[PDB]
């Protein structure tokens, strides 16, 4: 995927995704965090929305699997999530950005992002993703009052 | 592009515990706070505090 | 946190110039995963960049340009990149000059347009270090021999010295003369600047190899200096080059208009004041006859 | 466009009052008379109650919107 | 500079951070001078190339020996006082408490300095950070380390105003360093309490106000019944500032709601 | 990593317990407020309620020389803007669709 042309970026979306998944069993290597980073900024100048989003997701998942919430917050803010993105990608991003808003004492925004998330995961099936966003939505409403 | 999920675990089941079934029920959070306690709650409160003997 | 420069940034409470330098090297190395946080504490770096007593101001200038390079904002990246001096250059071949020279060159051509065209305080707002990065890159175009690239850059910056040396380099003279006629007719909009390219296009059809008089003619038509084409035509007629003084007059007739063909015969009459074969081609009588017979 | 009317009508009365007060132009008691009924008729004195009602009628208006 | 001359600076810090622990017992003014020179042996350590670890095991076992030099120096950084002072240390350390999980062992002195890192965020009234930080240490640890449990429940009482929090600021004595610093918070607590009481009551006796804001004397309570502006009759009398003048004016809406209506019209008229 | 959020709910179970007592009653003694909320002392109660007030989450008042909290409730919601704000929310959402 280091090669050129703009069509390979798309299939490199799926590439990155499995890359992180397998890297994540043994021990979610934080080494990859830099690769992702380097390949992310590149994608922002090639303006590959798709790769930009997908990649940005696996990055956020990296910061979140550890306790680097501040580091994801200042990021989520300073960065622009692409406009065109497959919905699956948008549901990931809306579950993570909501997780973050939730931890820093801001149940306000959260309860409105959380929900948009639940309603973008594919309808017929999506078992786990939905099954967890519930465990959080249920608590953000309670917390909210 | 994606279309999958496989990054979160799930639970799939055929042993399912029961609650109030919902078909167009009003599904009030009030009815899960009781257990058909209402016959019991009368009898026991009419004997304990004697309001079946002292008080009609 | 780990991978958070919170440990780095919170340094600089004691004034030890070797605590600022060891800091702007451990940070400078890793602004590729910390940045998101650096954004919050850029003030410690700008204050250091402004004070000239510190020699650590070249990396403060770089680290600063490294916050606005990863932020995407740019703009500020030029003011700190040119403040880094020689640490930033075209030849170290980084992703920084990769982007920052696109941002520099566009930030620069935007400026030379509005400036060279309108006020008399033209270049005065323009920095010289930016011109230095532009010329350092351009000379890379003359060393890589990409005259096919420099022929266009030389109309972005709108300096005809760039364009006049691009054409001379190598034996790529007659080809460059083919690009600069296609761009002088289609690309060029501003009549003023277009004329300034046509003049330099005249001088290189005289001082480079045998002068081609089928080209200087067309260009003198679009420049509209009749008093000069009348003397470029009236020195080949004195040297017995009538075969090359016909080719000029048939171009002038076909290409040029009637108020040009009446200015040149008039310049030959003011000069003729103390035969007339070219007076019969610039008037078009003989051509009329030929077409009738046809 | 209605306010564009009220604005200039009132404006004309203001130029008239300013015209008799100074740069004298003999007073015509009648004009000033009527001009008092104007400032008694302005909707004011029943302030609190009016507020509580107007809010309610709006509420209805939204329900149907 | 071999690793044995670097070592020769480590021992030059053992001669100053055992004098910080012997002048902690005697509590001398030379307790201040063994920390003015551990703020100097800092500027000697960073030149032996001991900035946060990015590999290398030899430097790793040289960073367990340079980490201490910031623990026992940070502890005196607190009692030395000043906000940025003990602040700019806590950074370094929370960074060297992920290096301590990396390839190094742990100590019982790591999760109790972090606790102070929490209390510091309470007296700075930034409860948004307290929670993020609380989530860095695993959950099962805030129920078993009953050194961290008091910062936690102190934030529980702090966020939802419950008092008995001034009483528990001298009962969190299991770690003495808590009771040294937490005293700062007690000047915000009084302020929030009087902020509510300004609205919650209207007549109480004076000695009760002295029993509520946790004062012992009558004099203090005169000064603080003068800053808020109350009168001193037989019972301390209040002024109505809860809803002094009601929002009985929709003339203030007026313009705003008209903007809104116009807006709806724009959405029903636009060409979409 | 949810357990960090959960422990916070102790604020809200009491927020609701007490805003529920306010809408159930008109006045009550602190001795009982502590008994329905499974709180601490009658000392703790008065501070808790007070906090609620200053956070406009109960609209009442306290008489301490007699020991009871007293509700000031007597609004008919429609003198509020509240319903008009709620609608201004609804139809913006709706219309956007």
Swiss-Prot record, chain C:
Modified residues annotated as Phosphothreonine in this record: 273
Q: Which residues cross the membrane?
A: none
**Which positions carry N-acetylmethionine?**
1
Name the source's superkingdom.
Eukaryota
* Residues forming coiled coils: none
Family to which this protein belongs: Belongs to the proteasome subunit S1 family.
- Complex and partners: Component of the 19S proteasome regulatory particle complex. The 26S proteasome consists of a 20S core particle (CP) and two 19S regulatory subunits (RP). The regulatory particle is made of a lid composed of 9 subunits, a base containing 6 ATPases and few additional components including PSMD1. Interacts with ADRM1. Interacts with ZFAND1.
Function according to Swiss-Prot or TrEMBL: Component of the 26S proteasome, a multiprotein complex involved in the ATP-dependent degradation of ubiquitinated proteins. This complex plays a key role in the maintenance of protein homeostasis by removing misfolded or damaged proteins, which could impair cellular functions, and by removing proteins whose functions are no longer required. Therefore, the proteasome participates in numerous cellular processes, including cell cycle progression, apoptosis, or DNA damage repair.
Q: What is this protein called?
A: 26S proteasome non-ATPase regulatory subunit 1
Whose protein is this, by species?
Homo sapiens (Human)
Swiss-Prot record, chain D:
Q: Name one GO molecular function term.
A: protein homodimerization activity
GO cellular component entries: cytosol; extracellular exosome; extracellular region; ficolin-1-rich granule lumen; membrane; nucleoplasm; nucleus; proteasome complex
For this entry, list what GO says about its biological process. proteasome-mediated ubiquitin-dependent protein catabolic process
Q: Which residues carry this modification: N6-acetyllysine?
A: 9, 19
Key words of the record? Acetylation, Isopeptide bond, Proteasome, Ubl conjugation
UniProt subunit comment: Component of the 19S proteasome regulatory particle complex. The 26S proteasome consists of a 20S core particle (CP) and two 19S regulatory subunits (RP). The regulatory particle is made of a lid composed of 9 subunits including PSMD7, a base containing 6 ATPases and few additional components. Within the complex, PSMD7 interacts with subunit PSMD4 through their respective MPN domain. Interacts with TRIM5.
Q: Which family does it belong to?
A: Belongs to the peptidase M67A family.
Q: What else is on record for this protein?
A: Does not bind a metal ion.
Relate the protein's function as given in its record: Component of the 26S proteasome, a multiprotein complex involved in the ATP-dependent degradation of ubiquitinated proteins. This complex plays a key role in the maintenance of protein homeostasis by removing misfolded or damaged proteins, which could impair cellular functions, and by removing proteins whose functions are no longer required. Therefore, the proteasome participates in numerous cellular processes, including cell cycle progression, apoptosis, or DNA damage repair.
From Swiss-Prot, chain E:
**The PCI domain covers which part of the protein?**
84-253
Q: Which residues carry this modification: Phosphoserine?
A: 28
What keywords are annotated for this sequence in UniProt? Isopeptide bond, Phosphoprotein, Proteasome, Ubl conjugation
| Gene Ontology annotations for the cellular component aspect, listed alphabetically | cytosol; nucleoplasm; nucleus; proteasome accessory complex; proteasome complex; proteasome regulatory particle; proteasome regulatory particle, lid subcomplex
Lineage, top-rank taxon, reads Eukaryota
Q: Which GO terms describe its biological process?
A: proteasome-mediated ubiquitin-dependent protein catabolic process
Q: Renumbered to this chain, where is the cross-link Glycyl lysine isopeptide (Lys-Gly) (interchain with G-Cter in SUMO2)?
A: 219
S-S pairs: none
Q: Does the entry feature the keyword rRNA processing, yes or no?
A: no
The Swiss-Prot or TrEMBL record describes its family as follows: Belongs to the proteasome subunit S14 family.
Subunit relationships: Component of the 19S proteasome regulatory particle complex. The 26S proteasome consists of a 20S core particle (CP) and two 19S regulatory subunits (RP). The regulatory particle is made of a lid composed of 9 subunits including PSMD8, a base containing 6 ATPases and few additional components. Interacts with DDI2. Interacts with TASOR.
Per the entry, what this protein does is: Component of the 26S proteasome, a multiprotein complex involved in the ATP-dependent degradation of ubiquitinated proteins. This complex plays a key role in the maintenance of protein homeostasis by removing misfolded or damaged proteins, which could impair cellular functions, and by removing proteins whose functions are no longer required. Therefore, the proteasome participates in numerous cellular processes, including cell cycle progression, apoptosis, or DNA damage repair.
Which named protein is this?
Answer: 26S proteasome non-ATPase regulatory subunit 8
> Whose protein is this, by species?
Homo sapiens
Instruction: Tell me the part of the parent protein that is shown.
Output: 79 to 350 of 350
UniProtKB/Swiss-Prot annotation, chain F:
What stretch of the complete protein does the chain hold? 390 to 486 of 534
UniProt similarity note: Belongs to the proteasome subunit S3 family.
Residue list for modification Phosphoserine? 29, 41
Q: Coiled-coil stretches, from where to where?
A: none
Q: Which organism is it from?
A: Homo sapiens (Human)
Q: Which domain of life is it from?
A: Eukaryota
Name listed for the protein in its UniProt record: 26S proteasome non-ATPase regulatory subunit 3
Q: In UniProt terms, what function does this protein have?
A: Component of the 26S proteasome, a multiprotein complex involved in the ATP-dependent degradation of ubiquitinated proteins. This complex plays a key role in the maintenance of protein homeostasis by removing misfolded or damaged proteins, which could impair cellular functions, and by removing proteins whose functions are no longer required. Therefore, the proteasome participates in numerous cellular processes, including cell cycle progression, apoptosis, or DNA damage repair.
Subunit organization: Component of the 19S proteasome regulatory particle complex. The 26S proteasome consists of a 20S core particle (CP) and two 19S regulatory subunits (RP). The regulatory particle is made of a lid composed of 9 subunits including PSMD3, a base containing 6 ATPases and few additional components. Interacts with UBQLN1 (via ubiquitin-like domain). Interacts with ERCC6.
